[PDB]
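The instructor's notes for this session suggest beginning with a concrete chain rather than abstract definitions. Hand out the sequence below and ask the class to guess, before any prediction is shown, which regions might be ordered.
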Amino acid sequence: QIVQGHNQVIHQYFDEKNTSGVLVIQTDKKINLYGNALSRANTEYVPASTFKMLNALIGLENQKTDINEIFKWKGEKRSFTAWEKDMTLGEAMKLSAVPVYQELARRIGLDLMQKEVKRIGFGNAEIGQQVDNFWLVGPLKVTPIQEVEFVSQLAHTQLPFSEKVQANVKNMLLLEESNGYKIFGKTGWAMDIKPQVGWLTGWVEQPDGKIVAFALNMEMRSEMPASIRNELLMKSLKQLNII
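After discussion, reveal the predicted structure:
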């Protein structure tokens, strides 16, 4: 079942930021909901850059790229100064460097991408006709419950992809480590749709090996710092004793 967990404290975290959010937690036994807008858990949103996890799996699986490839910066202006360099798929994951993942998506091509997204059953599994932006503006949408299930399957090497491909993508997703707890995950922020949606979807590998998956999903506004997603996640995972 999917139930609200214990949390007046986490409800208050979201309220203090003056926005609506949910945090979905999946253990080997249960799915629990936390936050101040629990109906978000079963609502579809554009995945934004969380879809890089699946883009990478599909690109690597189909040998459109490899973890050693250096993607060339051809010199154009890019939203962030940090993106204006040659980099690997794994580097671009961490920077959320959309141009690299757009180049990859074009290599995959609309037809293979739609076939793979249908095979995985990700969200509504609709990609439309534009292969290089369907995750940012639609029509692809996915609920937070569906994202936490996807990322739990990746964490356990249970997606229907090569084991080595799943290991390679997991290795691109390490965000932080605290006292032997490793926190993996991928941020997203769809800034160009209304309302704006922020994500942080991932899992914790605890020191004894246990895995606890998460999907944070919240309404963003343009004044917020991008770090808000990480801040609310970390504080909540501490409150729940997951880290």
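Then share the key points. Residues 144-155 form the longest helix (12 residues). The radius of gyration is 17 Å.
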